[PDB]
Design an enzyme around this catalytic site. Sequence first.
Site, PDB file in Angstrom:
ATOM      1  N   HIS A  96       0.847  -1.063  -0.034  1.00 16.94           N
ATOM      2  CA  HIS A  96       0.127  -0.060   0.233  1.00 16.94           C
ATOM      3  C   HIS A  96       1.031   1.483   0.307  1.00 16.94           C
ATOM      4  CE1 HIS A  96       0.706   0.296   4.454  1.00 16.94           C
ATOM      5  NE2 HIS A  96      -0.148   1.420   3.769  1.00 16.94           N
TER       6      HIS A  96
ATOM      7  N   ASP B  60       0.061  -7.387   2.350  1.00 16.71           N
ATOM      8  CA  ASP B  60       0.482  -6.013   2.316  1.00 16.71           C
ATOM      9  C   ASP B  60       1.936  -5.802   1.933  1.00 16.71           C
ATOM     10  OD1 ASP B  60       0.541  -3.101   1.999  1.00 16.71           O
ATOM     11  OD2 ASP B  60      -0.223  -2.590   3.881  1.00 16.71           O
TER      12      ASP B  60
ATOM     13  N   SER C 283       4.538   2.682   7.614  1.00 14.55           N
ATOM     14  CA  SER C 283       4.004   1.419   7.496  1.00 14.55           C
ATOM     15  C   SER C 283       5.273   1.125   5.984  1.00 14.55           C
ATOM     16  CB  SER C 283       3.528   1.244   6.117  1.00 14.55           C
ATOM     17  OG  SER C 283       1.926   1.345   7.059  1.00 14.55           O
TER      18      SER C 283
END
EC number: 3.4.21.5
Lengths: 257, 10, 27
Positions: A43, A99, A205
Amino acid sequence: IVEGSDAEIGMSPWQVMLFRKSPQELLCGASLISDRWVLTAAHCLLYPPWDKNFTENDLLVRIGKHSRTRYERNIEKISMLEKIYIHPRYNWRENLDRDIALMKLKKPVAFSDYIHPVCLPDRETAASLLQAGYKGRVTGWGNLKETWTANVGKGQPSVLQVVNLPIVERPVCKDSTRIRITDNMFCAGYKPDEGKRGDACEGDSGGPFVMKSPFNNRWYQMGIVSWGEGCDRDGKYGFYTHVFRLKKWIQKVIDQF
Amino acid sequence: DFEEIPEEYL
Amino acid sequence: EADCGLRPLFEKKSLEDKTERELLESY
Ligand SMILES: *[C@@H]1O[C@H](CO)[C@@H](O)[C@H](O)[C@H]1NC(C)=O
């Protein structure tokens, strides 16, 4: 990173910054796994609900960094991307299942005191270390607190932050959130009864969750910072992509490319 | 906010 | 890959970082 500390020099030499060319922006963290391959969350590159779909040419990887904002001349190395590989079954709808993404660099990066790859786990290392209560380590330059109008003070760190966090049992992870979790994820963080703090947060992230193996003295990347709900909230845990579970795709991409 | 990086990168 | 996960300023110098032992104690 919330309620962490400043990294020591060379403490996380696999840490990578995913840096946007224009506008200048920290996009995400990432990790170095060989001289030409970098691992991150999918992402960070592709997330349609936020109109995110980057190409190779839009970004740079910056390796060997400590300061968030300085150009660390003769310390950091800046690499261009040859190709992005997103897991073919990445599901941005829903719950960010699978992810994970790889980036191949245009040229190999030279290793140094500040730049060195992390190991990926094998099945014994994953069974040995990925156990509830065992702590790993998360690093990043992301937000120091959950974003909130009432916050006072600087929201982003001067230098790379580090926090050590215990893995949590899957039923506790599951019951902590109404978001659907899968076996491609694990969660970590202190439980309410432990009375402690620390979490990843937005801007972290793609960075690594690493563990040290006493079997052979090496650090292994077991997770990728993926998602959470707020940051450092009571009764919540951070969620991480389960690297070992997705390792056959990693190996397929590197062996093919 | 971020220091400029060399324009060869970009 | 052969030398992965060994940090020049820590494992290769037999030096610990300040919170590494916290990890080992948990394991
Ligand atoms: C992302 O953009 C690429 C071109 O860079 C395109 O091939 C792809 O279809 C786009 N995917 C989404 C989900 O927008």
